[PDB]
Structure formats: C-alpha cells, structure tokens
Symmetry: D2
Subunit: 458 residues, 4 copies
C-alpha cells in the first residue's frame, strides 16, 4: 500500500488547524459494489411501486461495470455521455446501445455540450453509477413500447425522485444497519491515522448528512474495534455535525441545533457553538465561532457537491477529495504500462514518418520535381503499416479499462470532464482517507508542473 | 514555433480568416500602447474634466502585464489562476497584503460572471491597467474630486471606445505608419505559399475599409511585384466585421464597391470581394463548406469564449505576441527549473520512505528515524520554495509570468488552452510551416502517466 | 366611424415633437385574412420542401377563425393556451382538440404558467394567428404517426424557422408586390391625417423593417393617390428609416447607413443624421442627433416587440399601438350588449340570493334553530334556477365571439395575457392609425380610473 | 370590509394559516415603527461607528409611505407605478426635479431585477425609508465620513436584520406589551366561530416559540374563559417558520415539546402540536388536502411573488393596515372624485364632437367651429388636472396614496392584486364574516364594458 496523495494545488498542512471529515464514504468506507447494488434495487423497486412503471423493470439486472463514474445524463434525449474537460463528447450511448460518430453529430450538431443547460444532469454522487445503469435500461424499455413509459426527460426526473426518497425514507439506512458487515469496511489504519494527526495538535470534526442516531451506530461499529481499552471514539472528534445538509451547509445560512448526546433531543443554539454534537448549521458560523481563518480548515469529501463555483465562492475552506475509483484506475494503468510504452514508441515513429513525408511532399511541390516521388510512395505505405500497428495496440490498451467507457480521468488523450471537476474542487485527492492520514500532519503539498505546450520539456 | 492544444490538419482547412490589426499586420506594441495611453488620459481630462494632474502621469510599459483583471468596485487589479483564484493583487500601484486581501475578499475566488469585474483581453489591456492604477493611485489623495473606483473604470472604458471610433487613434497612426506598423516580408511570402496550395485567405477586421486599404497597401505591397495588387492575396475582405457578434450573431452583409466605397444590400450568396458587417453563419454556408474547414486567427480573446465556441464551430487560432519574452525568460530560467525538478524528485523519494515507515509502525505497532526523515523533507522543501523565488526574477518583477498564476496556470493560460487549437508568437510562424502540415497536440499527458511505473 | 382612441396612460400630444410610424400594418393597412393566408401557405410550403415533412401537410386547409390573437404556444407539449394577465390558463388545446379541465391540471400541475420558461412561445407578431393554426394541425398529424414527424418542440422551431425565412426570402414581398390591390388597403383619411398633424408642426418619420426598394413602392401605391397634383409622398416624412431591425433598433447600437434615394446605394454615416432615407440605425443616436428628449417622440406599431421590459427600459420613447382586431371585438361586444346586460341583472339577483342564503344558514347554525329551514331550502332551488338561467345566458354570450377562444382582451372575467401586454406597452391604442390622426395633434390623453376593489363606485 | 381580487369559497377552505406578528396579533404601528427606528440608528452609531450626529435624527412617521423603493446606488427613494415607472422621486428628504430625474435615470422605468434596488415590503419599510433618507441627507455634508450611498443602505439592512435576531427588539416589546401590542376581543371570537364551523387554524410565524407563547397569552387569553387555553384555538403552531422559504423550499420540520421547548427530528407525518421550521409541501401532504383548501394570511408580501405563487399553490390573503387611512381619505375626497368623473364625461363628449367634425371635413373637404371646440376641450382639461391636484391634499403630502402612483395603480397595488385573493385592513374583518361565505370579485370589469353602448 503506497498511500499516494495527488496534489493539484499547494496546501500547507502545517497551517491547517481543523480537518472536517465527511462520514459516509470518506471517514467510513463502504463496499462500493454492494452499496451501489442496494441503491439500484431500492430505487428500481420504488419505481415499480410508487410510480407504476412496467412490471418488466423488476426483471432488470444490475451489472456494476455497465457504467463508470463521471458520466453525464442527457435527459432530453435519453442518452449518457463521456465528456472531456471542456465538454467535448468523447463517446455516447442511447440507453445501452452506443451511438455512432455519424449519428452523434446529427443529434448534437456540435462536439461540445453546454452543461449550463438544465437538460443535462452532471451531478457527482454516490449513486451516479447506479443512476446511469438504471436510466440506460429504462430508456431501452421505453423504446420498445414508447407509450407504456413516460418521456426520457420524465424518466430521469422520476428516477432522481426515487433516489432522493430512498435517501430520506431511511429504507437504505435500516438495510445497511441490519447488515453492517456486508456494507461497511473496517480499517485499523484510519483510527491510527486520526490519532496520529490529533497527536500533533490537529482538531478533527465530522460533517455528515446522516442523522446522529445513525452516525453514532456506524462510528462505533467502524472505529471502536481499534481503540485502546477505555477510549471512546468520541475523543477522536472535536465536533460532530449531523444532518449537515451539504452543500448548503457550506454556503447557506441554516441554523445549528445542539444535540443531547444521550437521548438525542435538540435545543436551538444561542451564542457560539462549543465542542459537542450538533445538527444542521453553516460554515460561516462554524468558522467564526472557532475564531480561525477559513483557509485554516480542510474539509474532505467523496463526491463533488454539484456547482464547484458557488461553493468555492461563498465558503473559502480548503477542500480535498477521496476518489474510491482511483483504486482500479491505477491498477489498470499499471497493467497497461507495457502497452502504453509500446504505443508511445509507435507514435514517435509515426510522427517521425509523417514529418519527413510532409516535407518531402512540399519539396516536390515547391520544387516542381518528381525525384522524391519514389520515397514519398514508400513513406505512404510505411505510415499505413505503423498506423495499423497502433490502431491495434490501442484496441489492446482498451481491454485494460471498462469496455464501454474507458478511463474515469481520461476522455481520449485529454482529461475527462470528471477529471476537471476533481482538479477544480480538490487541492489534493487520494483513493482513501488513510492515504492522507499516513502522511505527516505537517506535510507541505506541492503540485508537479503541468507543462504548457510552449514549455520546454526537461 | 507553433504550439498545439488540439489537432488540426491543415490539409483539411480550405479557408484561413485573418484578423487585420495585430495579427496579419504587426504593430510596434510599445509605441501603440502608449499612443492609446496618451489619447485616453487626454480624453479624460477633457470630456470628463479629470484633475489636470493626470497629464503628468508617465507610461511604463512594464507596470502591467497581459491577462490581468480589473476590480472596478474596489479599484484593484487582480491576477487570477485558471479557476478564478486571486494569486496576486494590487490597489492602484500598491500591492495588497496577504492579510489585507483576506479582509477585502471573503473568498480567494472571484466570479467573473459579476459584471463588476473587467476581464476583457484587448490590445489595450496593458494601457488600461497602468492608467487605471495611477488614476486610483492619485484618487485617494482626495476622494471628492475623481469619481468612484467603479465610475473611473467605466469612464476610462468609454474613452478607449470613443477614441477608437472618433478616428482619433486611426488618424494618428495613418499619418505616421513608419512609427507604428512593422513590415515583414515573411508574411506575404507565407500567404502566397498557402494560396499556392489551394488555401483561400480572407480578412476579418473591426476596422473601416478606408483605413484597411491604407494599412494593407503600406504593409504588404512593398513585398509585391510591380502590378501585383495586395488585394489579390485575399479571396474576401470583410470590414467593420463587428466582432465578436460577427461570429454568433446574425447581422447582414453589405457589398462594398472597392472603387467609390458606397455599399449595396446583399441578395443571394456572397462572392469574392469586399464586404462590411456580416456573420459567420451566412459566410460558411455561402462558401459551401463546414465550419471545421475554416481557420480563423486573431490576437485577442474577444468576449465570452463559450458563446463564441458553442455557436461558431470554426477552428480558431491565436497569435500571442507576449510569447517572445515569456519564452526567452523561461529559457534563461531553464537551469533553475531543472534544479526544482530534481528537488521535487528527491522530495517524493523521501516522503515515500516516510509514509512507508509511518505505515510500517502500524503493521507492528524506530521513533526517531522518522524525525531525521521529516528534517530532510523540511530542508528540501525550503530549497524548493527559495528556488521558485529565485526563478521570479527572470520575469516581470511586478506580476510574474503571463501563463502562470503562482504555481498554477493563469486564467489567461486557460483561455488560450480553451480558445486556441494552435497558438504562436506571430502569424508568420504558422505561415512558415508547410500548407499541408498536420499539427498534433503534445503527448505530454501520455508520458505524464509514466508516474504509473513509479509503482 | 367613431375613430376612438383608448388610453392606458397620460400622453400630452402637445409635447410630442416627432411621431415614428411602423410601415407594414400601421401606416399602410393590409387585408388581414388574405395576408395571414399567404403567410400560412408560404410557410406550409417551405416545410414540405426544405424540411421534408409528410406530403399530407400540403392538404392542410386554412381557416382564419381556428385561432385568435394573443395565444401562447407550449412547444414542449404541442399545446396552445389562452392566458390571463397573470398567466392563468383560461383554456387550452392540444392541436385542434380541446383539453378538458381535468387533463389540464394533470399536464400543468398548476393553473399558472411561467412565460419566463423558454418552452413557451408568446411573441405577438403579424403571423401569430397563422402560426397557431398551422402548429395546431401539425401536432394533429404528428399524433397520427408519431414517427413520420419530429417532436412537438422540433415542429414549433421548424415552423418558426420557415416564418423567419419566408420573411427574408423576399418570397412574401414579391407576391404582395405583384398583387397589391389584393393585399394592401388604401385609405384617404391616413393622408389627410398626416397632413393634419404636419400642419400643426408635427414631424413624422417612418421606421420599418422592410427594405427601401419595397417601401418606396408601397408608400407610393398607398399614399400618392390622395396627394394634390405635384405633391410627393416623401414630403409627408422627415425621415424614413428602413431595415430598421426592430426591436433591436430601440435598444441595440447598430449603425445607420445613408441611402441614396435614387439608386439605393448606401454610405456609412459620419456625424449627425439629417432628414432623408436611411437603413438600420438605433434609437439612441436618432434621438441625440435630433436634439430632443426621448419622451418627445411617439412610436406607433402594430405588434408587441417580444420583451416589453428590455425595450421600455433602454429606450424611453413613448410607445403607442394599433390593434387591427379591435374592429371585430368592439363589433361583437355591441352585438352582445343586450345579453351582457341580461347576464348582469341575473348575476345581481344571484348574489342577492346567495347572501341571504349564507346569512340564513349561519343563523340556523349560530342560533341552533330550524325555523329558517323552510326558507333555506327554497333559496337553494331558486339559486339552482337562476344558476341555470345564467349558465345558458353565458353559452349564448359565447356565440358572439370566436367559438374556440372567446375574446382577445378577456380571459374569463379578467384580462387576457394579451390585454396585459397591450396595457404595459401602449400608452394608447386604437384599431387603426387614422383613428389617432383624426384627433387633435394637441390632445391631452387621460385614462379613466380603473377602480380598485377597495375603491367606492360612483 | 373584505376586498376581493379573486374568487374564494370559504366552504372549501379546511385550514387557515395565520401570520402571527402584525396579522393575528396587532401592534401599535406608530410605536413599533419608532422602536425599530431607534434600535437601528442606535446599532449604526456603534457596530459601524456612524457620525454621532445621527442620534439627533427625529422620527416622523409621515415622512415615508408603504410601497416605496430604495435606490441604493443613487441614494434615492422611488414610488413606482405597477409597471416600474418612476412617478415620484426623492434624494434623501429632497424631492428630485422632473428635469434632474431625467439626467439620473435614462428611462423612467427601473428594473427591480437589478439587486441594486431594495423593493421588499416589510413591517419596517417605513422606518427604513425615513432613516435612510436622513442618513443620505446628512451624508452629502461630508462624503468622506459616512460610506457610499449603496454602502449605507446595506448597513442599515444589516442592523434591522441583526436587531431582529439579537432579541433586542423582542425583549423590549416583551417587557412592555401594553405599549406595543393591541388586544381585540373580536379576533378570538371570530377564530372560535370559524373553529365552530370545522375550520382548522394554525400559526406560521418567523418568531421563536418562547416569544410566541408570551405574546399569544397576552393578546388572546384575556378573551378566554377560565381554564380555556389559547393553544386550543390552534391545530398547529409552527415557529421559526423561516418564511418565505417555508413556502417553496424543503427545510425540515422539528417537533417542539411544549413543555421544555427541546426538539426532536420528525419521522412520519406531522400531527397537531408545536413545530419549528418545516415547509408548505410536507404540511399540505401530511394533512391530506389540496393546496387550494388552505388559506394563508400574512401582512407583508415577503420576497418574489412569482416564486411564491408558482411553487406554493396555497390560497393567500393579505392584511394591509394602511387601508384604514387610505379609505377614510378617499371618502373625504369623494366629492372631488365625483367632479373629476363628470368633467371626464364632458371631455369625452366634446372630443367626440371634435373628431366628428374633423372627420366630417374629409367626407366633404366651418373651420372655426372646431376652434371654439378645441377651446372648450382645453378648459375642461385644465379643470381636470387642477381637480386631481385638489385631490392630492387629502393624502400623504409627500408621497400621495399607497395604491396609486400618479394616475396609475402603484407597484404595491399590483403586488396586492397579484398576491392576494382577498385583502382587508385587519384580520378580524375577515373573521367577522360567515365561515361559509363565498367571496366574489367585483364585476367592475363587467360594467366596465358598458362603454360599448356609448356606440
Ligand atoms: N475557469 C475554468 N472553467 C472551466 C475549466 N474547464 C472547464 N471549465 C468550464 O467553465 C465554466 C464556467 O464558464 P466561464 O465563466 O469560465 O466562461 C465551468 O462551470 C466549467 O463547466 C477551467 O479549466 N477553468
Ligand atoms: N410589473 C408587472 N408585471 C406583470 C403585470 N402583469 C403580469 N406581469 C408579469 O410580471 C413579469 C415580471 O415579473 P416581476 O419582475 O414583476 O416579478 C412580467 O414579465 C409579466 O409577465 C403587471 O401588471 N405588472
Ligand atoms: Mg460522503
Ligand atoms: Mg408593422
């Protein structure tokens, strides 16, 4: 376990006084497949029941790999898109069927899409992958008998409704509570890590959207097992804020509620908040009452809270991210190394051949001569041969990543739209929290130069 | 020579549209900037009765840099990162303190959507900043004379716009072409080379035709055989294009009689000749080609890129004159960079050995060995930040590099990346290449992921 | 001919120096039915040709009364709506079929619609009625074989495209030019009226979206016939601005072009514009160069230029309106007078009976008595009888107006959304220009009190 | 008594939701306005160090009127027509000249969409205007002390908001209930009457519960038999409702223990009792009724009406205290109105005879007969405008009527028309009517179209 932390922007951990941790999926790890699957089932169920959809949907099978993180839903046309950082359509599907390059240009009349347009759903959530798989299948069925089901737009909204409902019903909560060892992953390192950081004067607080009754259970289940006899998980946290109501917690002005740690009853807050348990709240008041600078607080989450601008504009806290999927992406890039290198040597040669060819052709034209005509014809075949070697090497490279969508962070040779989001929202990111907590709580994180096209390589 | 952001096969390009002022025709920046600088302060202490003392203000080309943003509300000039983060700020000529900055701006990120910020890349951006700075500099000395910070900014803008239409600016440079425009044989040769390869070239300028004729004759003719008319270099010459709107709007074309200058309304498709106004839509269709077969080259990112790239579809390239100095300076700082690279690598090696031990104390619950390691980390870090500081002296002393905002790329760098498929210092750099060249984006991100073998 | 001018807001004609006249449909009258029909044909044609729509559309028949002015198109659901001034749905149709009250609530989940939403098309134009009739029929056909035709949204946009095209092709212009006596109505009064106003020192200018070559023809054809031997229609106008490009002419900054009245060639303008012919332009410069106050200029048009706010915000000219349809509305309200009165006497009685009934019932309940039980039962039947008399009188009142849409200015008992537009954009309005020109060019126009619910009637 | 804009059959209303402060519970406006007035100026010359001289400022209830709008940018107070046209303006306490107005504002129409204008109808609107006026009044006497026009406005707002949460305002009125709140037996009787008819009443206040108990006990109990608790008058009592958001947002409900005040999160539907927060959506569903069966009555048009009427669906009524004076004054001016009506009728008769002759000179191409007619027109017009002027003395001398902006209805009048189905001077006016009454909008538009017989 390398425990690597990737840096997008400088952050001096030495100057960070408080570290705010998201609970579900950040501080406490969940079995992604099992959890996505549950959400899929609960959501698919709520559709056939409270929305009266074809009895056929209950038959839908869930396959984790049918979708990947970072995808965008075009509710208008019932399509799913893989975008580049600037919104360029790398690839698209209508339901499960992949759209061809030709038909793509017919539909979008451009290569770029405007995420500003409300028709597109591009929210990074813990249920995005399930959303995509389900939505895909739903439109596949809607195409069979385009009367038995609502419109593409309507379906997407219904599904979103169920997801929000299932996340409020408590139906999801109760099921994972009754099956904790199947859903939550325990990790000694996390506890050691927190202790490490606290040991150096760091203050750690929890900022979750789950209610306290649920957080008390889960925190106990996942942390206590690694605490010394007598210790209490509560000693690890300065504050524990529940039903935080993020992202609004960061930019809105909802009030704090003091929670009685025993029974759970609450009282309105008057004056500054003091170490303890709370509900709701807002970053503004939290930062003021702790008498510190916003940039002295680091919040770590697992998914981007919709609009990065509105959030980084009215908050000012340092934000970091945990991206669970980095696990397999890295594992896959390593398994593809030899091919990645092969593709590099091949491209090098290709561009070599191409330059020589360009110049020879312009010489024959500039010089009005036919002496290069022989060589030019060979370069042509030769380039046709390497172009073939490469095209095949590429297909080979694809087998190391998700067959339908390729990499989470790459949209062709450039960054995926999700890559941009990560870059804009997170100063640093890692596959999991213990990756960060294994570093020095004094670490000065810097980013390796990104190199501009006019920059000289070294 | 030519930097690639996105692929573009010149073999597929059928038409190359060129911006006239500052793209096809080069100007002596220093000279031009000052002229506009003088004409604006001059127009201020007149059509606005500004304190006669401003006439005393001197122009120092290096007081501002390209890419800066003006905060009219607070009378500040900001250098934002690609994501809108303030990485260097000033109030007039005074650099705002790290602490002072915190009080003025709640967040370090500004919203350029707020019309209060002036974030327009123009050929007079530098002059604008320099002046606006001194104006506010000698505005706090009596906040009862000169209007509000935001008022001043709006006035200065009005002067630049008026002086650009009064003909005040054009008339001066037209009566002293030798002092403002620079001739370059290469430009005409390259154009003829591309035309020899089937390319159709056309001009798309915001300037009037009468002015265009004078400038084009002066700058291109000296490189044209006897009887060879510069107009033969261009398939179409569109004047008073009214960009950016020309690109996404629907204003109509006016046919211009090259002789008397008079104009007639257009009926039917346009044909090779001189026009006024127009819009990219009608042009593309009239030429029966796809937008991706047209390459437009300008010098400034006029307006909102998204509206211009979503509604146009034309390939767009950019000429960025400031590259000359930026490159040279980076070439001088090259040895420092190399040093910073080595230290980062040694830093990575040490921080990894650190986490290994720190992670090795959990797989078996040697407490000082870590300490000496932390110590080394701290030392190489200190060396790194001092190295970056050392590097700052090779660039504009007041605002640093144009493409970098602190360690990150600047907002301007982002704009170039997003707006331009290829960019160069000057137009002849592109025209020097073969008309059938295939530009490929650096596989920098390819070798970038070599960090995978580190594992 | 009463020549009535309706006043929404005070306007002192004495203080008005320049009167700007819209040409097509304001200064020059057109035969509405014939003109709408032409637009319908040309637009329906352009669809089956450049858009490849079912060959069946060519069969579509045009009936002027199938639609009325002021309607709103819900492109999203292929529906046409009659709105109240606050956006309340008075009545709706899906194509030609009328939607029931029940299904209406199903579709809109409210009684109010947000015109702000881009899905609704609510632009008042000279081709709105044709647009509605055509769109209605198109969706009717789209429902037959929902595959042979685009989506409701797509159809509405295609149709709009054709309308704009046909208005630029010049196809419409050439046809009316070759048939002037079938399309344009001549009226001596207009000419006398202009002379009247000019006689009193009023300056009159034309502001049309048509090009000069066409305006010169039409103005000559429709005005000359009433000019004294030797006079020239051009003497009636101070300025004549063509290809004005409204509404943008009012708020944008497009430049003026000087037009050579003989040949038509143009030159860019430098300095102030002087009496003569022009192309393009903008209100700002026009008002400045004439050295007058914007409120000293009155512009009269025939249709509301989309957004009333953006226009009245950046212009400041007094705006008046000519509403051709007032002709039949007034004619119909007069033919309905006796019934309107009958409905009034009946409602009076009804509310009389209802009050007595309300009070008797609350007395029996407040007093816990059964002595009023007899009377209350009679009031019930009696009210049931008058309620029936009225319901029938109403149905009778409907036969005086368009069967599908009722009145242009009324949406039930309240004002129609179109009524609001007229009220917000026009300080005064009349059925036709000569109505205004027949008044004193010194007339001080005032509005009759509108009476607020708390206002005492006199 | 009760004015109807839109139909509402009380037989169909199942629940009546009431605003507490200024709706269910009446306050002595004069007193209350001044208290807030004093607390704000007090908080200004303290948390903002404003010129000690402001403490000298006196409060004159008649210096402002309801419905006015504040132009923070230019430090002005405007009275707009229903369409946003300025029909009366002031800079501080100084009435802006017709000409001066023209220079400041390009158009006579303002865009209330521009966040620069403060157009919020609150129970302290009057105090806000009066103070803000004097502040700018004694701000131009030294534009170096007190911040910018727009700054001042934003500060004053902060004080009003803080003083409303510091508890500063609540504490004062709670310790002197007799001086601020007014008791009214009628209110309790009517409530009980409606409850006797099946109606369910509930409170929806932005105030805290502790404060609510004190105020409700003081104002309702004195009219309740021994052992009859005011809380029995209400099915639900929702506190810290956080309106307007309560109506269109999705904030959660908190169950309040009437005893200790502590709260618990809500699971399942709500039941009769005390709550905090919440949203109209969950409330309506939990009660298993349609929005149109709920009537909410407030005293101020909180926020954007469109967002509140499009996303809510509840029937909304409004209590407008200023009606008392407005009506009385109109009743006094009644004889003038009658006169104006007669002259308008004589004007119409004459202008028609005018056009007839003018139209009769074209049907046969008597030139002075018209002249004498024009003369009469002019005379009756003069009489009309002088009559309207005569009428202005019966209303606020500085701002005229609340519902009229010049001759047109004011922006406030529009808001009432759009937001309220029925409106009254005070709540008991509605409660006085039978619980099964059917309110019908005046058939004024019906008899309005009698102008058709004129033909
Ligand atoms: N500022 C910035 N915006 C980006 C970048 N990559 C993509 N974007 C897009 O730019 C959008 C905002 O548009 P802008 O205000 O820059 O015109 C963002 O919401 C995002 O969708 C980037 O690197 N920098
Ligand atoms: N100001 C105003 N707006 C109205 C009236 N009747 C309808 N409206 C609607 O109000 C809209 C603007 O929303 P507002 O800014 O008033 O919230 C207008 O575009 C129009 O659709 C009216 O009498 N006055
Ligand atoms: Mg989480
Ligand atoms: Mg017209």
């Amino acid at each position: 376990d390398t425990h690597k932390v990737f840096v997008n922007r400088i952050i001096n951990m030495r100057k960070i006084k408080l570290i705010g941790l998201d609970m579900d999926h950040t501080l406490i790890r969940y079995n992604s497949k099992n959890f996505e699957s549950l959400v899929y089932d609960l959501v698919k169920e709520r559709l056939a029941e409270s929305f009266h959809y074809p009895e056929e949907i209950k038959k839908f099978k869930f396959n984790f790999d049918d979708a990947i993180r970072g995808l965008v839903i075009d509710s208008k046309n019932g399509n799913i898109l893989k975008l580049s950082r600037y919104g360029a359509i790398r690839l698209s599907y209508h339901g499960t069927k992949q759209i061809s390059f030709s038909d793509q240009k017919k539909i979008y009349r451009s290569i770029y899409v405007d995420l500003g347009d409300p028709n597109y759903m591009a929210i990074d959530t813990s249920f995005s992958i399930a959303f995509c798989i389900l939505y895909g299948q739903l439109v596949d069925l809607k195409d069979t008998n385009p009367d038995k089901m609502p419109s593409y737009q309507a379906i997407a909204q219904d599904v979103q409704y169920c997801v929000d409902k299932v996340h409020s019903d408590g139906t999801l909560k109760n099921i994972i509570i009754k099956n904790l060892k199947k859903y939550v992953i325990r990790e000694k390192e996390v506890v050691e890590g927190l202790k490490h950081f606290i040991r150096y004067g760091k203050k750690i607080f929890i900022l979750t959207n789950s209610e306290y009754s649920y957080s008390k259970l889960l925190l106990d289940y996942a942390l206590s097992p690694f605490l010394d006899k007598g210790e209490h998980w509560q000693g690890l946290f300065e504050f524990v804020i529940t039903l935080a109501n993020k992202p609004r917690f960061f930019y809105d002005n909802l009030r704090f509620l003091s929670v009685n740690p025993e029974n759970g009853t609450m009282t309105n807050v008057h004056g500054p908040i003091v170490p303890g348990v709370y509900q709701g709240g807002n970053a503004k008041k939290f930062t003021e009452d702790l008498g510190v600078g916003g940039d002295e607080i680091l919040y770590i989450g697992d998914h981007i809270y919709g609009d990065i601008l509105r959030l980084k504009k009215d908050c000012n806290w340092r934000t970091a991210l945990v991206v669970e999927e980095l696990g397999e992406e890295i594992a896959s890039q390593i398994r593809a190394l030899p091919i990645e290198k092969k593709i590099g040597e091949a491209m090098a040669i290709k561009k070599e051949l191409e330059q020589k060819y360009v110049d020879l052709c312009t010489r024959s034209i500039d010089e009005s001569s036919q002496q290069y005509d022989q060589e030019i014809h060979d370069l042509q075949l030769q380039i046709s041969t390497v172009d073939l070697q490469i095209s095949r090497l590429l297909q080979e490279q694809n087998s190391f990543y998700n067959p339908k969508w390729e990499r989470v962070f790459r949209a062709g040779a450039e960054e995926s739209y999700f890559a941009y989001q990560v870059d804009r929202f997170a100063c640093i990111y890692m596959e999991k929290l213990s990756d960060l907590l294994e570093h020095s709580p004094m670490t000065y994180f810097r980013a390796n130069r990104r190199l501009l096209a006019h920059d000289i390589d070294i």
